[PDB]
Every structure is written in C-alpha cells, then in structure tokens.
Ligand binder design. Structure first.
Ligand SMILES: CN(C)c1cc[n+](Cc2ccc(OCCOc3ccc(C[n+]4ccc(N(C)C)cc4)cc3)cc2)cc1
Ligand SMILES: CN(C)c1cc[n+](Cc2ccc(OCCOc3ccc(C[n+]4ccc(N(C)C)cc4)cc3)cc2)cc1
Lengths: 353, 353
C-alpha cells in the first residue's frame, strides 16, 4: 500500500474526521489508514479507512475514497450529488474546495476485451439507457458536440509545435481540410435524427466498474462512473462513442501507450445485441411492439449510431491534438489522433458517406 | 404584474428556453411571460411561464421561479439539489452562474401570528425534525455557532460608524463586555447536551410557505424553504431560534421595520406542544416509551432549547450590528440588535443563568 505524503495524510485525516459521522469523529490520527490509489498532480485518489479495531457506531462507512482535484466545479458537484441520490453513482460523503469523499466501491475496471462479452455489452446498454433518462438541471440545447468540435478545431489550427515529429504529424492531420470536413459531418448529422439525452460522453472500459463479488452474476455487475464530461447531447454520440472504444486499448505498456485495431469495432450483429438491450431499458413498452416495428427502430438506430461514431473520431482526434500541445501526461497523443482520423475515413468508406 | 427590465426579460427567456424541456424549447419570445416577484440588487425573484395557448408536451413545468444572484455557491447548489431530490425542497430545473430555475410552489409566507397556531406549530416541528435527520455532505464538526459568533464579535469591536445615533447605540451594546459574555454563554452551552444535526438556522415565518389549497388541511400544509444558512449545528439552536422568532414581526411598515414583543415568546405549554410533535418525527419509536421517560426527555429538551435560545439572541444581535455597518437594506439594524440583547438578558433572568 503506497503511503501518501505526510501533508496529504494529515489533510485526509482531518477531512475524514470532520465530514464522516460516527466513529470517524473520534478517530486517533495514529489509527487512520490511507493508501494511494492513483497519484499525479491532478485528480489524485486515495482509500481511507478506520482501523479494524474500531467499531462502526451507526451506518457510517468504514472505508471511503478521497479524490483530490490538485463554473465547472458547481456543475460537476451538483451532477455527482444528484447521481448519488438516484443510486446511479457512488454516494457523496463530503465536498470541500480541494476534493471530495466518495463511497468506496470494491471493483476493478473492465479491460477492453471485456466490452464484447455479450452479457457485459447488454448491461452497458441498459446502464446507458438508464443514464439517458436522467433529467438533470443543465442546458438541454445540444450545442456540446459541434460547439466543442469547433472550439478544438480553432485551437488545433493555431498550434505551434517545436518538436519535429509533432510538426510533421500536425501538418499531415491538417492537410485533410478540417473546416470542410467538419461541415460535411455537420450536414450528415443534421439529417440523422437522434434524441437529445443526458450523455456520459466517455463510456470506455476505464469508466466501467466490475463489481466485486458480482463477476459471475447474470446482471447488475457493472457501474458506470466518471461522469465529469457528461452533457445533454445526441444519443447517437454516446452509443457510437462506446462502439468506437472497442477499437482502442489504453493499457499498452510501451509508446504510444495504446493499441488500435479497426477490426475490433463491433459487428452489426454485436451492435444489434447492444441495441436490443438499450431499447427496452429506454422505452419500457418497447417489447410490446411488433417484430416489424422493432426491426425498423433497430435498423434506424444502427444507421444513427454508426453515423454518430464519425463524430467520436473527429472530436477525439481533435482533442488528442490539443492534448499533444497542453497535456502533462506521457501518451502518444499525435499517434492517437492519427488513429482516430484513420478510423473516421475508414468508417466513412464503409458507410458510403 | 411588474415587468422586468428588457435585458432581464431576454436573459430569462434564454435560460428558460435552453434549460426547460418540452414546449419551452420552441417557445417564441413574444409569448414568454415573466413578472417580478422580488426586486433589488441581489437575489431577485421572477415567475416565468408558458402562454396559456401553448400545450405541455410531456412533464415540463408550465411555470417556474427564476432566482438571480445579482465555495459557498458549490455548497448551496449541492444542498439545494439534494433537498430537491429528497422531496424536501422545490425541484431544481436549471443551474447557471447567474442564478437558478426552481419549481414554482403556489403559496404565501406565514405571518408571525400564525407561528402559534397549534397545527402550524406542530407541523413546523415535524418539518424541522425531518430536516434534522438529513445526512448531508458537509462538515459535521459543530463549529458553526461559536465560530460565527467569534467572527462577528471581532468585526463588531472594530466598527467605526460615522453617524451619531449608530455610534451611541454601538457604545451601549459593547458596554456589556461581549468577550466575557460570549464565554459565559459558551460555558453554559458546553454543559447543555444537544445533538449535532443538520440545521436550517433560520426557521422564521418568512421561510415557511403555506401551500395554496392546503390552508384548511390538518397536516402537510407547509414547506420550509430558504436553506442557504443551513449547517451542521446543535439541535437546540434551531429549535430555540424558532421560538425566538415568535417575538419578532418583520412586516412593520415604519421605522425600524420590525416589532418586538417579549411576551410573545412561546409559553412552556406551547413549547411542549412543539416538542411533542418534534420528538416522534425525529425518533419514530418515541411513542412507545413510557410516560415517565417521555416526560424526562421533554423536560431535558425544554432546558436545552431555552438555553440555546440565548445563542440565537447573541448571534443575531451581533449579526445585526454587522449589518448596520455593511447592509444596503433599509432596516433598523441597531434597534434590532438592542432588542435581541434585551431579550438575551431577559431570558438569562428567567433561566437563573
Ligand atoms: C474528454 N473525453 C470525454 C474524451 C477524450 C478522449 N477519448 C478517447 C480517449 C480515451 C482514453 C484515453 O486514454 C485513457 C488513459 O490511458 C492512459 C495511458 C497511459 C498513461 C500513462 N502511462 C505512461 C507510461 C506507462 N508506462 C510506464 C508503461 C504507463 C502509463 C495514462 C493514461 C485517450 C483517449 C474519449 C473521451
Ligand atoms: C443569517 N441568519 C440565518 C439570520 C440572521 C438574522 N436573523 C434574525 C432576523 C430575521 C429576519 C430579519 O429581517 C427579515 C426581513 O425583514 C425586512 C424588513 C424590511 C425590509 C425593507 N423595507 C423597508 C421599508 C419598507 N417600507 C417602505 C414600509 C418595506 C420594507 C426588508 C426586510 C432580520 C433579522 C435570523 C437568521
């Protein structure tokens, strides 16, 4: 168990002692347990717990997660609290300017290869449909997708890299005429109906918990977490983005720190499986429709999500160029951008668009 | 219906159109209805509605309340959202840097004279007991009461007024040796057990809605609102503060814009009525205790709340001196401070403390 810095141990102790009820309120510092889950300069994570020799007095948690950040803060905090109330996220035990105390959920993250297991995929779809029914106190105009793409496009155009390979790679990505391609994509998506729903916007394996002790259970073995990029957006984006994430493995241990495989995109059969779980979770009398009406709804959704998958590639390709300029994480951002653009044109070839 | 300024109408229209679903998303500006509920430079309130000629498409509200403000913002927003989720406050429809959109609750505020009606008092007690059971993600150390009193005491000591009557009045209030009196109060309250609960801290008639159409109902005719000063604090403060508010009427239409009457404090009989509704709402098997045990719990609570009532006087007396220095509202702050201190020493005489 990696121990935090002394300053961090002391602050964590104080936050626990003051924001948690019951035994925590009287806990001795020399009996406080803390270990690092994720280090870094931002969004550091720690597990904090009572000693085994201290009894619970009421319903207080014995262990919590501390997130340190290291207005978007109001929106994210409100969102987190609401999801907690609704039993769709970890409980919220404490909020303070430096961070928050969250329910500790014994789990691991999914690996990329697990996203295609039929029971896993079906549950993700159900979870996403549930998330998409959330009414949330946020702007409902679906400006997020193309607003963010336009923002990132204008930033990318102005980047001045100093390192040769990044200069070269950028020149290649910008050679596609990104302003025109963005508007070609806008025109396509303007003629692709997709309801506006509350989207996660990052439904990748690293944001999906496999709950400890539920690994052999039929259903209800996952939790979708890490909602910080959620917004009202087109349903098609969230689903298409998920499908895209089948192609990328971020656990690759050498440069560029990911692996990409175009052949791992879900087949239409796999997509139909996902869609067939999504739809009755999103409209519960769906099951009562005729076979033919279910069939047209599913076919329309296949086209919808595969078209919107293009926007996942375009948006996250542009994002990754911006990260190559601004990030402080070691990751092959330029190579990832090229993988996304390569997949964008591959999918465009496949769609006939 | 007082109309807002054109800029405000336009912003309100945009906030409604973008944060509310259904018919609002397509509403014409020339059919948007808005009127001012409360003006001012801070915390302005407006009612906003669909025209009667526009149909609801789903479950969207036809009318909302707009609050404009004109980190405490994170905490207050999180608190509001959580209370809304739990059905203890108005629903939260939109949050943005300038304000929020809230559920519109047809109602009026209570008048001071209504606080003593036995059914009203019993319901307030039930509502307060319910609020006091809230688990909330805020600091649980009860530093709020004396921390705030110390802050305000140090500020009051340093005030330099320029206007003669305020100079004179301040000299009189400070002549009591407020540092020593604060510590006398601390010593008394240190020997008065009172559980730490989530307190409203401002349970006055102006924060209690009488729900339209429930005015002749037995129960469930009120809503406690305006939670912005809530904090974990001693239960005794919230109850004692409420009792204090029986003495003050803030609707008096001439200077000093309140009336005070020491004889309107609840009698012990009235207090027992309030307590007898509070306790089974706060500990639901209370009713199953013996008569003698119920009797000792009630007697202990009478002493607890009447002692803590002293802290309502002291704290809000100090607050009102600070407002005489910093406020921009026309209100007889110095006279109100003197009324609170007069009541502090009256209650101390009555208690024998
Ligand atoms: C903003 N948003 C909602 C997005 C943005 C981007 N994407 C696509 C995307 C998703 C995950 C993603 O990276 C996931 C994290 O992967 C990491 C990989 C490596 C590292 C660092 N690293 C370097 C070296 C190393 N070794 C020593 C082996 C281990 C880890 C950190 C994170 C990158 C792009 C989706 C949504
Ligand atoms: C911070 N906190 C939780 C507190 C602070 C103080 N107190 C005690 C207190 C409560 C209410 C209170 O004032 C309530 C509002 O009363 C007003 C009265 C008059 C006005 C302004 N005014 C002036 C002139 C006028 N006429 C033209 C007749 C009408 C209104 C505004 C508000 C003053 C002290 C409790 C809790």
């Amino acid at each position: 168990d990696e121990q935090p810095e002394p300053r961090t141990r002391r602050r964590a102790y104080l936050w626990c002692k003051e924001f948690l009820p019951g035994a925590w309120r009287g806990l001795r510092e020399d009996e406080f347990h803390i270990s690092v889950i994720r280090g870094g300069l931002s969004n550091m994570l720690f597990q904090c717990s009572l000693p085994d020799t201290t009894a619970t007095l009421g319903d207080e948690p014995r262990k919590v997660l501390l997130r340190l950040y290291g207005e978007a803060m109001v929106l994210e905090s409100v969102m987190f609290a609401i999801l907690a109330e609704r039993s769709l996220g970890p409980k919220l035990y404490g909020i303070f300017p430096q961070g928050r105390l969250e329910q500790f959920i014994p789990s691991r993250r999914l690996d990329t290869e697990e996203l295609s297991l039929p029971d896993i995929s079906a549950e993700i779809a159900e979870k996403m449909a549930t998330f998409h029914g959330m009414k949330m106190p946020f702007n409902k105009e679906p400006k997020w997708l193309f607003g963010t793409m336009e923002k990132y496009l204008k930033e990318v155009l102005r980047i001045k890299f100093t390192e040769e390979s990044r200069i070269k790679k950028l020149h290649k990505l910008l050679s596609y005429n990104l302003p025109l391609e963005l508007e070609n994509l806008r025109s396509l998506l303007e003629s692709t109906p997709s309801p506006v729903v509350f989207c996660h916007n990052d439904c990748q394996e690293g944001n999906i918990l496999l709950l400890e002790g539920r690994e052999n259970s039929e259903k209800q073995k996952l939790m979708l977490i890490d909602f910080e990029y959620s917004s009202y957006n087109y349903r098609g984006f969230d689903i298409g983005n998920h499908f895209c994430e089948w192609m990328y493995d971020y656990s690759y241990e050498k440069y560029p720190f990911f692996r990409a495989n175009i052949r791992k995109y879900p087949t239409k059969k796999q997509q139909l499986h996902f869609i067939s779980s999504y739809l009755p979770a999103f409209q519960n009398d769906f099951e009562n429709l005729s076979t033919e009406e279910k069939s047209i709804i599913k076919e329309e959704m296949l086209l919808e999500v595969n078209r919107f998958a293009l926007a996942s590639h375009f948006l996250w390709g542009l994002w990754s160029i911006v990260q190559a300029k601004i990030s402080s994480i070691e990751f092959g951002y330029m190579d990832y951008a090229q993988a996304r653009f390569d997949a964008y044109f591959h999918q465009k070839r496949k769609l006939g668009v």
